[PDB]
């Protein structure tokens, strides 16, 4: 098969072929809009292992996100508090840029459900992603049970509750001694260990 | 593998046109410093002879000047002193002992230069003369490390068949690899330019 060759070509990104293709594609994507439809995935191996079964009702969007730190609001850089919480510039935004891209293309296409998303390109000013949205009420998805779970009403806006592939990363969810503050979700395992458990017969 | 090329074998026997004893010359390669103590300082036993002519200037004393009349080359004494300092140069290497160490300060300017004497590196002043003479007339190699990076030695003769010359270049590779200090670089056998005396160089 021909996907191992694309996988191994895409793992070598500073070679001459991929940096020429990087430059041509970063120009081409910068000439278009921020959120715009991609007719066809540019990384069919990497789209395909995230879940892109190429048939009717699968949609690729391509999206730029503005790159860099999160500068705070609070006008003229004054925070009106302690000198601890007084920095304006170097704040750094707990979600990824890939999560911002997924949320934006899930707000434009609002009938569609975001499955995953992957990196396609970057320059100094922007990062460019392709998001792999699934249309859940098309009849090629509402049956053939490998993909009808996205039809369920609990999966509305996966990208804005942290349930995509970068959501559960940037929520800190994994197994381990390393992920103790956030393993069942951070705020439930905060509230359950600042709960005062009091019984009927006081233990 | 050293089997496809010659390297000690039958393949290079008609390349040289001289029908005289022409020996093979192996050169090791491992980078060292500019010091004088580090490296491969050892002269082991070579099991097969190098097929060379050499005469020994045995200048012995009371307890050791009797075993030279059976298996040796030349019989000398410590009284004949006015020859080996001025004129005569008819030798290849000598052999001494520990019993007379006050005559060694005399034959320095003529024999230490062209490798006809001993300073500290070759087993020349060995005491035993009844068993070590079956090892020097079957001529050994010359492991002498030079300044930056070479080790020029000689293994055997090209006209000798590959039956005597099958465990000689293997036991010599087990001397420059195991006795060596921990100031040598990676894969201690790096390059082996092996040429005998007249033909092309056959390397690994």
């Amino acid at each position: 098969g021909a996907y191992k060759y694309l996988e191994e070509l895409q793992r070598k990104k500073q070679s001459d072929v991929l940096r020429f293709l990087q430059r041509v594609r970063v120009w081409e994507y910068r000439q278009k809009n921020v959120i715009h439809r991609a007719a066809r995935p540019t990384r069919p191996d990497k789209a395909r292992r995230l879940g892109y079964k190429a048939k009717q009702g699968f949609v690729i969007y391509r999206v730029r996100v503005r790159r860099g730190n999160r500068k705070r609001p609070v006008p003229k850089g004054a925070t009106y508090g302690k000198p601890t919480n007084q920095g304006v510039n170097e704040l750094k935004y707990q979600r990824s840029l890939r999560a911002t891209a997924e949320e934006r293309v899930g707000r434009r296409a609002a009938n569609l459900r975001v499955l995953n998303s992957y990196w396609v390109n970057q320059d100094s000013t922007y990062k460019y992603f392709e998001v792999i949205l699934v249309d859940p009420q098309h009849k090629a998805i509402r049956r053939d049970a490998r993909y009808n779970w996205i039809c369920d009403p609990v999966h509305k806006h996966r990208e804005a509750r942290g349930l995509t592939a970068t959501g559960k990363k940037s929520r800190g969810i994994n197994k381990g001694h390393k992920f103790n503050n956030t393993k069942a979700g951070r705020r439930k395992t905060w509230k359950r260990q600042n709960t005062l458990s009091l019984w009927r017969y006081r233990k | 593998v050293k089997e496809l090329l010659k390297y000690s074998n039958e393949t290079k026997k008609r390349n040289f046109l001289e029908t005289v004893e022409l020996q093979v010359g192996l050169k090791n390669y491992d980078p060292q410093r500019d010091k004088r103590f580090s490296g491969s300082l050892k002269l082991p036993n070579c099991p097969r002879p190098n097929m060379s002519i050499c005469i020994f200037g045995d200048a012995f004393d009371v307890d050791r000047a009797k075993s030279c009349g059976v298996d040796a080359m030349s019989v000398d004494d410590l009284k004949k002193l006015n020859k080996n300092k001025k004129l005569i140069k008819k030798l290849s290497k000598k052999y001494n002992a520990f019993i007379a160490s006050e005559v060694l300060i005399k034959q320095v300017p003529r024999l230490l230069g062209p490798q006809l004497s001993k300073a500290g590196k070759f087993p020349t002043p060995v005491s035993h003369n009844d068993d070590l003479y079956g090892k020097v007339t079957d001529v050994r190699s010359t492991i002498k490390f030079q300044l930056k990076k070479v080790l020029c030695l000689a293994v055997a003769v090209g006209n000798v068949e590959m039956e005597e010359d099958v465990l000689v270049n293997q036991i010599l590779m087990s001397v420059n690899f195991f006795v060596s200090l921990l100031k040598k670089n990676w894969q201690n056998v790096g390059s082996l330019v092996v040429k005998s005396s007249m033909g092309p160089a056959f390397r690994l």
Binding site: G1, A2, Y3, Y5, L6, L9, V17, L21, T42 | -
Partner: protein, 174 residues
Amino acid sequence: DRNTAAETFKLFNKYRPETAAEKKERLTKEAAAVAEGKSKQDASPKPYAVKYGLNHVVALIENKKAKLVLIANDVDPIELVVFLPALCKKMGVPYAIVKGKARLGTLVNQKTSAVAALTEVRAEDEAALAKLVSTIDANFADKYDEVKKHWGGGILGNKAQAKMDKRAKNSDSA
């Protein structure tokens, strides 16, 4: 070029896959034959269609089974097809880069194909196939090293080209 491409697509026009009506015909044939002669899918003769699909053609080049492979000077995700000249040079399969992935699709009854491959061939067109292989390897698979050394591109636009001609004629000549 168009002469060898015209010869090649005469040869590949002779080997098309089945359309849907021909498959309906062979379904009726095998439905008669299995129910009557009890010949399990072997009453119909062995086909000789062209091979298509990119994973299929890459498996046929890996297992040395492809006689001739055609590639399109096309697909905009170029990484799908840049490794095929290297595979076809490495595995010894003769390969040519034919113009258009529309023609490769219409000789296979698709919209786009991006690969084509002969593995089987009848005894009729063997000498013509060998002459095509000869001309194609005269153009492609024997110049692989010379093409792999050279850098294309750098071609300036005609206004800058004319200004470069004016300057480089006025820098040296008079």
